Amino acid sequence: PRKEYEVACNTGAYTSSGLATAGFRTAKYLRDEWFQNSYARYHQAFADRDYSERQR
Amino acid sequence: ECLFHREKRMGIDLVHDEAEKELLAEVDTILCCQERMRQHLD
């Protein structure tokens, strides 16, 4: 599902990432990847906040 | 392991295709079915 979607997302005549079955992606990042990682870590702690306050 | 050996190729020969898709799908199905086994065991 999501994994086949992402592997099909970028397969053209342009540079691709090092994503595969296993191993590790090479450290060299791309703009959208870094942005999405930032947004994810962003929303994580923010959700933890109201997670705590609902028990407060 | 088959998927690992699948990635050793290089050059123009890195094409993604139906075989890779089916390996992905069977891995997913194995995971989901063993999870079903877990729930029906518990």
Partner: peptide, 6 residues
């Protein structure tokens, strides 16, 4: 980074 077609 490659499709079957090309």
């Amino acid at each position: 980074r490659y499709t079957p077609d090309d």
